[PDB]
Amino acid sequence: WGYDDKNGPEQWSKLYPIANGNNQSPVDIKTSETKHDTSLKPISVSYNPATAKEIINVGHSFHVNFEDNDNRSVLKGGPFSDSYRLFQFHFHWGSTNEHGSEHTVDGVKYSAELHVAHWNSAKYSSLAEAASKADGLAVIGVLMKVGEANPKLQKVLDALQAIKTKGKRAPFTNFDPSTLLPSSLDFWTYPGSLTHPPLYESVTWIICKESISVSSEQLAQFRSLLSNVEGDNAVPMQHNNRPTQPLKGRTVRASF
Amino acid sequence: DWGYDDKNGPEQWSKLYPIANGNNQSPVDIKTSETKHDTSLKPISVSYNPATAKEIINVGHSFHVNFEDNDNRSVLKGGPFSDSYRLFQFHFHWGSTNEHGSEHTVDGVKYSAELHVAHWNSAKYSSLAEAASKADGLAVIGVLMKVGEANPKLQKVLDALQAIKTKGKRAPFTNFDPSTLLPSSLDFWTYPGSLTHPPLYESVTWIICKESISVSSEQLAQFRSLLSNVEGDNAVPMQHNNRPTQPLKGRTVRASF
Ligand SMILES: [O][B]1([O])O[C][C]C2=[C][C]=[C][C]=C21
Ligand SMILES: [O][B]1([O])O[C][C]C2=[C][C]=[C][C]=C21
Ligand code: NA
Ligand SMILES: [Zn+2]
Ligand SMILES: [Zn+2]
């Protein structure tokens, strides 16, 4: 699977029939159809920068992984009773500034999207166990709007020259990704899925109402990553965003 | 104005620069069966002062490394020249794939990239501006670059590119001797030709090295990740900047070897 014409989102259903499921992500958030929910607590993130481990080129994207052996780095509050343990963050982007986000708001496409992903360590003992469970994953999505350079992205962008080609990985330490989140954590939540294979319907989404910035040139740094292995013909990672999927009667709730 | 796109690319240059259809246009294919050995060709000697290195700049279609050219600290002599020529710049050309990015070809074989090391005649002229339109004004060493092992001599140049990502950005670039980029052997071909992009002046004595240098697939990708756009506009990678070979129109390619 990938994002090419032949292996791309429109074709994922042949290998992963859940792609046509009732809880697929991302979605278009229509603000006229959201339900304000008075029981939603504020989101609480508490991340320890010592849990930052490694950055990896996974061919379609890059991942920044965290040590997830204990509760040093946790998400709480919002719609959750359980504590969720941070394991990774990554981005999605598009071939031009016009699109690149996965979630849209009232049909508006942003230039990129940050996913901060967590697993339910109250109910499950590993990511592997949690990743297929309806209540297994909690993911913060942050819409990235093209504009001013975002200096919080700096350590991340500076690391990419060490993982230019598929499979390269390097230590990535002493970093607290709550520094990438917007000032307001007002949010939408809905029950959904991973946005690429295996597309498990295991994600409670937390979509920030406030965007964060990214420059045209910062997005070019993402797009200059290579999907090919070292020594092969360079194939830039031009995009990795999935189109929005049908709500199929799910309700998007607002904290605000 | 002019570029390497279908709209404004080399096949369209003759509209704005009629000399593009001239008798001394570059690059050319070197057919080794038709080269003539000329006993009058001395060895090339380059003596470059690494304190003449000045600035690296994104020029929209390419990037240039510029040298102070106020005196003759950094000079090319020998080969077909009586005069010393003063170093002013080096730059590269590359292609959209590893299969064809050089400008000059040898027996029809296209290399992955090409280095140009450019010099102006400071014996006869007082400035680059004066020298540039003159038949005897410029001397340019071309080196063919063959995709394979990473070339560590390219390191300081490729490390500098993050400071000049968009059109018009520039940064200091100091203490560099570009003779470190040349092959070990300086056996060469020479022919009278032109600048390979506008304004296409027929002012260049070409020195094409017989020996190639290395470059990796990832090093070429670093060139292609430079942006042709100005800061703040949608990123447009510099995918290629190599002109096709032009007719010899009776010129002779002479061999030093
Ligand atoms: O974009 B993704 O497929 O859905 C969001 C959650 C997640 C977590 C880790 C890797 C990938 C994904
Ligand atoms: O590729 B070019 O147009 O012909 C080579 C010589 C030269 C020198 C400086 C800038 C450009 C060029
Ligand atoms: Na000789
Ligand atoms: Zn994601
Ligand atoms: Zn050139």
User: Does residue A7 belong to the interface with chain B, where contact is any CB pair within 8 Å?
Assistant: no
Q: Confirm whether residue B240 is marked as ligand binding.
A: no
User: Does residue A159 belong to the interface with chain B, where contact is any CB pair within 8 Å?
Assistant: no
How many angstroms is it from A9 CA to the middle of ligand 5?
A: 42
Q: Which of A97, A145, A216 to mutate to test the interface with B (most CBs of B within 10 A)?
A: A216
CA B201/CA B17 separation, integer angstroms: 9
Residue A196 Cβ < 6 Å to ligand 1: yes
User: Does residue B233 belong to the interface with chain A, where contact is any CB pair within 8 Å?
Assistant: yes
- The residue whose CA is least distant from atom 8 of ligand 1 is A117
Contacts with A148 (C-beta within 8 Å, 6 or more apart), sequence order: A213, A215
CA B65/CA B54 separation, integer angstroms: 8
Measure B171 CA to nearest chain A CA, in Å.
17
Query: Which candidate from B166, B220, B234 shows the least CB-CB separation from A234?
Result: B220
Active site residues of A: 60
Q: Confirm whether residue B100 is marked as ligand binding.
A: no
Paired sense of beta strands A28-29 and A104-105, if any: parallel
B237/A236 touch (CB, cutoff 8 Å), yes or no: yes
Surface of A (57-76) touching B: CB under 8 A: none
Eight-state DSSP code of residue B62: S
Q: Report which ligand 2 atom has the smallest distance to the Cα of B103.
A: 1
Method: X-ray
CB contact burial B171-194 (16+ within 10 A = b; e otherwise): eebeebbbbebbeeebebbbbbbb
* DSSP-assigned beta bridge partners for residue B170: B57
A97/B220 touch (CB, cutoff 8 Å), yes or no: no
User: Does residue B169 belong to the interface with chain A, where contact is any CB pair within 8 Å?
Assistant: no
B217/A236 touch (CB, cutoff 8 Å), yes or no: no
Are B144 and B151 a contacting pair, CB within 8 Å? no
Contacts with B159 (C-beta within 8 Å, 6 or more apart), sequence order: none
Considering its fold, how many domains does chain A have in total? Answer: 1
Q: Token pair for residue B151?
A: 């070339």
Q: Token pair for residue A69?
A: 């052996």
Given phi > 0 = left and psi -120 to 50 = alpha, else beta, which region is B162?
A: alpha
Domain of B163?
1-257
Are B110 and B92 a contacting pair, CB within 8 Å? no
Are A103 and A231 a contacting pair, CB within 8 Å? no
Measure B16 CA to nearest chain A CA, in Å.
31
Q: Report the sign of the C-alpha dihedral through residues A239, A155, A152, A136, in that order.
A: positive
CA B28/CA B131 separation, integer angstroms: 22
- The residue whose CA is least distant from atom 11 of ligand 1 is A194
Ligand nearest to the CA of A139: 1
Are B2 and B17 a contacting pair, CB within 8 Å? yes
Are B223 and B101 a contacting pair, CB within 8 Å? no
Eight-state DSSP code of residue A51: G
Query: Which residue has tokens 């690391």?
Result: A159
CA B46/CA B52 separation, integer angstroms: 14
List the resolution, Å. 1.7
Measure A152 CA to nearest chain B CA, in Å.
18
Residues with CB under 5 A from ligand 5 (ion): B 116, 196
Q: Token pair for residue B232?
A: 């703040």
User: Does residue B235 belong to the interface with chain A, where contact is any CB pair within 8 Å?
Assistant: yes
* Residue A174's CATH number: 3.10.200.10
- Residue A201's Cβ-side half-sphere holds a number of Cα atoms within 13 Å equal to 14
Chain A residues within an 8 Å CB radius of B149: none
